[PDB]
Design a protein around this ligand. Structure first.
Ligand code: MG
Ligand code: ZN
Ligand code: ZN
Lengths: 1321, 79, 98
RNA sequence: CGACG
RNA sequence: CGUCG
DNA sequence: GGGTATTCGCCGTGAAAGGG
DNA sequence: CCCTTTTTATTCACGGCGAATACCC
């Protein structure tokens, strides 16, 4: 049918040829007859009548009379479908301007003409005139004259002075201006390049003129002459019954426009003066302003009851527009909604469906079965048999709800596990039974939550729901390789109560023959569940290839573990059963069963675990009470000594010894210590409270308390809630930021007053408002994050790249946080890894890292592995199967044709709701390593540093790095190179208030150019403060001979300039050495994630060095501060400024290097990309986002951040144009440059130089090749104006463009169909 | 069966097997083909997915079967 | 509440919503994103073109389900035609190229 | 188009 | 996500 | 003769109803 | 179905982008 969408401007002849007649009458409804009027908005001879093949008079009632015209008014026979495409047009006696080309920010008319916006508003609102056709006139052609200048402007010039007022003057200025000679003069003006802002503005104007030249549109079409209308079927007017009439606002706006046009037409036929026709044209301008788009001005109109009317543009943009509520999200049929229910008797691949919902949602299937079985006569007889509640169609439902899966769905959807497929069964009730194993993925508790169910109709949809969207196929998380099917609270409690160790029970000390005898002894009551017995077990191993061996052994175990061993299949050993079996142990057991056996035995094993847990949860009988929450008897003594200590420190404060600012910290510290002591005593009382004797003396074991069993196994509730329940809950903080020094003394078991209940309500209301705002902030963040990487499909399997990233575990300063196994799992490396010991080849280039190569990688103890990433790929329009690696859902590689960007955005946006809104020493033993620092020896035997970007590492005895630190400039070193250090030893010591000015050489110091009164002030203390205006002092040194001391290698002499606001204590004439300073000078969370992904500029950014070279001061803060960094063999046209707030860290007598930080604070993400490299900003933002995520505890793999990073820097700019058609100041795509330079560099032509720039999630999404996906994201008017001016041709390539036109998205089968379509074409 | 795992081991793409199973189950419903496996109160999708796993129905097998049926049709129309 | 076939709106060819009026459930944009996380090509093709739009296509799909054919047609969404007639009502021209 | 959970 | 006019 | 740092506004997202 | 005159004047957080005055060589 169609393959592309072309958008351009609207010619008036095209609008005249689109319609069929002209409207003259403004009246629509006559309020007496049901038939519409012969002329108006609800026309009959233009759009057509309502009745199929019937005119207004009532003369055509036969279908054979189709093909003639009516003689009464001209109403032909039509249908109900063709009435929606017929349109009408309205002529305009006075021209008017457009709104989308006036306030486009920047304006199109303001960019095309040499005029600011305020003069265009003055001409369009009839405030000032413009001179037209001056010719030989001293006045400028674009000169603005006032009302008093028109008289002498007309009576002064000898020629005819004709100046138009309104849109006709703009139309004459557009018709009198050409395009080729103007762009030729602008290209001739390109060689001046006086200022850079004028240069980029001039190249923008040249690009706009070229976009007007190459397109087939005219600039004169912005002035509206013919205005089309909407069909009446798109604006329904239902006749209501009441005192007032119900109508649409757009019809009233069109009626007001026709009324103003008819008033202007009646006004032009009476020879009216200038002011009344000026007011009439102004009223028509306000009418066409209110019709197209109102609210952009300062005065938005209100129709009725103080409500702004929705124009043509208001019902398109926004959240309630047509793009978001009618195209991407539509209402569907064959759907239901009910309340969820547990239903523990079901399996994993099935759910429970009511009989009424299964009878309602499957009406045409029942009708088709009754037609094919030959039981009903027609469809009406089957309908009468269905709606009469007969017992004949009930067993027919057993044949259609047997192998037909339905699509269960929750109303909040965060990722792909929110929509799963189950095979529904017929239950009795009005509720849906949702399986408890998928409740961890659905995040749905049974406190009145509702879920939706959908019924697929197509055979391919049923096969895709069975093979891809099934619950048995999706058992792993999309963000990481962890199983999502976990026992939450009840099954883990049953497995913890069944498998536990006791010291004395019924039937202890007997040996059994097998697990069946243990189950028989448990069911008969002769033996207890928790007793140390000996059974004969046979475990199966698969160490051989093709068969499974067996071994028989007798181990001391429990009766409950012997019962649970029958649940465990042959593929798992006995080491996973004989443990404590907490919460993570069952997850590790299921992961081991999935990684050893596979998917088929795991889905039965999890169901058997859930069945055994639900069976033994009734046999346990765990209950809570008063005696279960014990109280420590030594709590009151700790409270008494704590209150005595607070009373003693309050007496010491009131006596006048310790100030309040330290006394408050002492009080909160001793209260935190008392709270920790009470918590430790409560934990020691809870974990050791039961003693059971065996023979004579007694023994102490783990207590069998119910709350301790629910807290230790991880069933429901963390340890902090048990600490707040039994022991004291601690200190409750104020919501403004402070915290009250007195804590809550009594716990929840004891009574409370109203003072111990107020601050808790304050914190609870603060947390509730915080989560109620941050869930909407996370929803907006993931809505912005889906549309960035929505068009990335894997199209290739292997490409071949030589670049990559340096994957290494990051060190923050203490211990490790992420090991080597969870960073490189399932990712293809780039090149060969160098061995530090023997220097051979370990891995090849293009190979996958499975669960066996990581063991060799951690046994070899490598430092950094060059691994291919998503950013360093070379595939055009997508990535390959090797640059991504494992998809974290299956054990094999990702198949070709998977949209991984949507999965990455859904896995990033899902745990976003959980996000809230002096000396350097070592810790362990090992050697040290210095980097980027020159060691200068001192007189005392120590080493001083000179560089600013130094960094210290800790190398172990094997060769790995386990600790790193960052020391600033000006700190002495205690340990040397190659010296083994111990724990608890200081390395570097410095002061954070004084910056050093110490040189590396010695000599007798001497003051130079220090006059008291102009630059220094002498004012106990023997020192002078350094503040003849442009004369800087110097610090020269004299040796023992008397000549000058020159540093070999550097042309700079041995002098130092004194900085401002610094004191100099030591005078001149003394011997100095190295080590004595001469001059003494004095948000994390979800907004941090939004700031990192949006790539916003910080509040106080840091300045990075562009080119390495010596520094030079231009000014000394007179009005500004200018610094010059000049190189040795080059010049510099770069002069930066200082915002007079950042501390100057770079000095004049130190080593310079490009890439040093001179201002403490956050750095800009754009400066690190353009100066350091491309693989440095990516690892930095990935490590920062991972640090923010690991501050809470969530686990997201690095590829999901890397694909968004790759989509961020997709745009690029051209520095040098050369022989290409692109300019040197435009922003185009990187893929077009990459496919254009391939034919230029291989041939004899020259290529263009490109430089990648970083863009946020908002700027990169709106700037793309398409105009449909950019119009439905945030805004609509600006991208539609750009697509109308430039004339872009859209191609349906991505995923979002196929949802609007309604066809197959590029899925895997979508990629197969697209490749078949490209092969056929 | 209750899960689709061995079809991934047979065809490691998990997108073309759905298309060839729909092509097998469509001709057994609209046109009418003899099922190669015995059915026990099953629909055409489960029958096609069961015929995929044994190896009697594949992509190139169905293509050469359609080609042989078209050649038989042209040979019948020739005589 | 459940609906297989019911009434539709007049401004657009979409089913209604609620319990007092005979309407169906809303398939939001997050459900489209979750379907795009899977393959779901023919599942998304039948969700927003056959069930809601294609007033001549959904009758053919109902007749195919009645006669016993689980085969659909792509058709043409009516909401895109409403959008094309709405942008053409302004001074912006937009058409389909073959 | 507003109120409520 | 619903109810009401 | 001439230019960008700083600042300050505008926009993006979550005056017309009453009688005869 | 059509003119006019005495004053309805109603309150976010954060970021991107466009425009009128200025000190220094
Ligand atoms: Mg709930
Ligand atoms: Zn007629
Ligand atoms: Zn690649």
């Amino acid at each position: 049918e169609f393959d592309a969408i072309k958008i351009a401007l609207a010619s008036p002849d095209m609008i005249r040829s689109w319609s069929f007649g002209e409207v003259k009458k403004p009246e629509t409804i006559n309020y007496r007859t049901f038939k519409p009027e012969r002329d108006g908005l609800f026309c009959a001879r233009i759009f057509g009548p309502v009745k199929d093949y019937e005119c207004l008079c009532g003369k055509y009632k036969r279908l054979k009379h189709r093909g003639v015209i009516c003689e009464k008014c001209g109403v032909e026979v039509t249908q109900t479908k063709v009435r929606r495409e017929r349109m009408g047009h309205i002529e305009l006696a006075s021209p008017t301007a457009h709104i989308w080309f006036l306030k486009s920010l920047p304006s199109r008319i303001g960019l095309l003409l040499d005029m600011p916006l305020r003069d265009i508003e003055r001409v369009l609102y009839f405030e000032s005139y413009v001179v037209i056709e001056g010719g030989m006139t001293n006045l400028e052609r674009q000169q603005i004259l006032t009302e008093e200048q028109y008289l002498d402007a007309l009576e002064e010039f000898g020629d005819e002075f004709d100046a138009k007022m309104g849109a006709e003057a703009i139309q004459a200025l557009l018709k009198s201006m050409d395009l080729e000679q103007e762009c030729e003069q602008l290209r001739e003006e390109l060689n001046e390049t006086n200022s850079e802002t004028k240069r980029k503005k001039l190249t923008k104007r040249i690009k706009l003129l070229e976009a007007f030249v190459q397109s087939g549109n005219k600039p004169e079409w912005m002035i509206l002459t013919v205005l089309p209308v909407l069909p009446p079927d798109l604006r329904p007017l239902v006749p209501l019954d009441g005192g007032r009439f119900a109508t649409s606002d757009l019809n009233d706006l069109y009626r007001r426009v026709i009324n103003r046009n008819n008033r202007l037409k009646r006004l032009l036929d009476l020879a009216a003066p200038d002011i009344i026709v000026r007011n009439e044209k102004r009223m028509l301008q306000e009418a066409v302003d209110a019709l197209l788009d109102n609210g952009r001005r300062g005065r938005a109109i209100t129709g009725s009851n103080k409500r702004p009317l929705k124009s043509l543009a208001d019902m398109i943009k926004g959240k309630q527009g047509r793009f978001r509520q009618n195209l991407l999200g539509k209402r569907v049929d064959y759907s239901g909604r009910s309340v969820i229910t547990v239903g523990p008797y079901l399996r994993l691949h099935q759910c429970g469906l009511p009989k009424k919902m299964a009878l309602e949602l499957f009406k045409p299937f029942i009708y088709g079965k009754l037609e094919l079985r030959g039981l009903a006569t027609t469809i009406k007889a089957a309908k009468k048999m269905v709606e009469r509640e007969e017992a004949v169609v009930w067993d027919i439902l057993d044949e259609v709800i047997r192998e037909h899966p339905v699509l269960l769905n929750r109303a909040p959807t965060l990722h792909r596990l929110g929509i799963q497929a189950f095979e529904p069964v017929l239950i009795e009730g009005k509720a849906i039974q949702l399986h408890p194993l998928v409740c961890a993925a659905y995040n749905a508790d049974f406190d009145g939550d509702q879920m939706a169910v959908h019924v697929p109709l197509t055979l391919e949809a049923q096969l895709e729901a069975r093979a891809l969207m099934m619950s048995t196929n999706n058992i792993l998380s999309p963000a990481n390789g962890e199983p999502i099917i976990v026992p939450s609270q009840d099954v883990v409690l049953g497995l913890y109560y069944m498998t536990r160790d006791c010291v004395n029970a019924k039937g202890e000390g007997m040996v059994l023959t097998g697990p069946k005898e243990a189950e028989r002894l448990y069911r008969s009551g002769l033996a207890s569940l928790h007793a140390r017995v000996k059974v004969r077990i046979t475990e199966y191993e698969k160490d051989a290839n093709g068969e499974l061996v067996a071994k028989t052994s007798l181990k001391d175990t429990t009766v409950g573990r012997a019962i649970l061993w029958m649940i465990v299949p042959k593929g798992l050993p006995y080491s996973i059963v004989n443990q404590a079996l907490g919460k993570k142990a069952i997850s590790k057991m299921l992961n081991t069963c999935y990684r050893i056996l596979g998917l088929k035995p795991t889905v039965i094993f999890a169901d058997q675990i859930m069945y055994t847990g639900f069976a033994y949860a009734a046999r346990s009988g765990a209950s809570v009470g008063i005696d279960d929450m014990v109280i420590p008897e030594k709590k009151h003594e700790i409270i008494s000594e704590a209150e005595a200590e607070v009373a003693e420190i309050q007496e010491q404060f009131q006596s006048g010894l310790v100030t309040a600012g330290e006394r408050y910290n002492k009080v909160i510290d001793i209260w935190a210590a008392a709270n920790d002591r009470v918590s430790k005593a409560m934990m020691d009382n809870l974990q050791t409270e039961t003693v059971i004797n065996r023979d004579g003396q007694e023994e102490k074991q783990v207590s069998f308390n119910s709350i301790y069993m629910m807290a230790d196994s991880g069933a429901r509730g963390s340890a902090a809630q048990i600490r707040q329940l039994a022991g004291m809950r601690g200190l409750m903080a104020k919501p403004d930021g402070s915290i009250i020094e007195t804590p809550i003394t009594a716990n929840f078991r004891e009574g409370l007053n109203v003072l111990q209940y107020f601050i808790s309500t304050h914190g609870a209301r603060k947390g509730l408002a915080d989560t109620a705002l941050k869930t909407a902030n996370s929803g907006y963040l993931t809505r912005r994050l889906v549309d960035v990487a929505q068009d990335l499909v894997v199209t290739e399997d292997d490409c071949g790249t030589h670049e990559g990233i340096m994957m290494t575990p990051v060190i923050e300063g203490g211990d490790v946080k992420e090991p080597l196994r969870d960073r490189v799992l399932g990712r293809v490396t780039a090149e060969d890894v160098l061995k530090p010991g023997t220097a051979d080849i370990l891995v090849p280039r293009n190979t996958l890292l499975h669960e066996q190569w990581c063991d060799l990688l951690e046994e070899n103890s490598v430092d950094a592995v060059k691994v291919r990433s998503v950013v360093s790929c070379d595939t055009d329009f997508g990535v390959c199967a090797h640059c991504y690696g494992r998809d974290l859902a299956r054990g094999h590689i990702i198949n070709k044709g998977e949209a991984i960007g949507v999965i990455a955005a859904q896995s990033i946006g899902e745990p976003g709701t959980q996000l809230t809104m002096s000396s350097i020493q070592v810790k362990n033993k090992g050697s040290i390593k210095l980097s980027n620092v020159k060691s200068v020896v001192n007189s005392s035997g120590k080493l001083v540093i000179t560089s600013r970007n130094t960094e210290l590492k800790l190398i172990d005895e094997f060769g790995r790095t386990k600790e790193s630190y960052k020391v600033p400039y000006g700190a002495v070193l205690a340990k040397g190179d190659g010296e083994q250090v111990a724990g608890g030893e200081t390395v570097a010591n410095w002061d954070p208030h004084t910056m050093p000015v110490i040189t590396e050489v010695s000599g007798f110091v001497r003051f130079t150019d220090m006059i008291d009164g102009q630059t220094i002030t002498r004012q106990g203390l023997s020192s002078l403060v350094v503040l003849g205006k442009d004369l800087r002092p110097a610090l020269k040194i004299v040796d023992a001979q008397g000549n000058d001391v020159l540093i070999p290698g550097t042309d700079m002499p041995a002098q130092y300039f004194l900085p401002g606001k610094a004191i100099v204590q030591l005078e001149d004439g003394v011997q100095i050495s190295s080590g004595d300073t001469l001059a003494r000078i004095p948000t994390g969370g979800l907004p941090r994630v939004a700031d990192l992904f949006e790539a916003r500029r910080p509040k106080e950014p840091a300045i990075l060095a562009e080119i390495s070279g010596i520094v030079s001061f231009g000014k000394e803060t007179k009005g500004k501060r200018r610094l010059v960094i000049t190189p040795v063999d080059g010049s510099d046209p770069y002069e930066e400024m200082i915002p007079k707030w950042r501390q100057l860290n770079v000095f004049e007598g130190e080593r310079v290097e490009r890439g040093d930080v001179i201002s403490d604070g956050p750095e800009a993400p754009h400066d690190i990309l353009r100066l350091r490299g491309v693989h440095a900003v990516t690892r930095y933002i990935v490590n920062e986002v991972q640090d923010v995520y690991r501050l809470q505890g969530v686990k997201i793999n690095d590829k999901h951040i890397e694909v968004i990073v790759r989509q961020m820097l997709r745009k690029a700019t051209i520095v040098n144009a050369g022989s290409s058609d692109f300019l040197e100041g435009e922003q185009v795509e990187y893929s077009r440059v990459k496919i254009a330079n391939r034919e230029l560099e291989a041939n004899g032509k020259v290529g263009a130089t490109y430089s990648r720039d970083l863009l946020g999630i908002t700027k990169a999404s709106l700037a793309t090749e398409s105009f449909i996906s950019a119009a439905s994201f945030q805004e609509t008017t600006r991208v539609l104006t750009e697509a109308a001016v430039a004339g872009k041709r859209d191609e349906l390539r991505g995923l979002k463009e196929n949802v609007i036109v309604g066809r197959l998205i590029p899925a895997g089968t979508g990629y197969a169909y697209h490749q078949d379509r490209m092969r056929r074409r | 069966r209750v899960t689709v795992q061995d079809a991934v081991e047979k065809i490691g793409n998990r997108f073309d097997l759905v298309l060839v199973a729909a092509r097998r189950a469509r001709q057994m419903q609209v046109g009418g083909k003899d099922p190669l496996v015995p059915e026990e109160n099953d629909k055409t999708t489960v029958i096609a997915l069961r015929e995929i796993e044994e190896g009697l129905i594949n992509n190139q097998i169905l293509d050469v079967r359609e080609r042989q049926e078209q050649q038989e049709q042209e040979a019948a129309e020739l005589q | 509440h459940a609906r297989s076939t019911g009434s539709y709106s007049l401004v657009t060819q979409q089913p209604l919503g609620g319990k007092a009026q005979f309407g169906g459930q809303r398939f939001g944009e997050m459900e489209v994103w979750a379907l795009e996380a899977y393959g779901a090509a023919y599942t998304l093709q039948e969700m927003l073109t056959v069930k809601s739009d294609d007033v001549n296509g959904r009758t053919k799909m109902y007749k195919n389900i009645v006669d016993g054919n689980h085969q659909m047609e792509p058709g043409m969404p009516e909401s895109f035609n409403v959008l094309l007639k709405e942008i053409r009502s302004l001074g912006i021209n937009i058409e389909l190229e073959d």
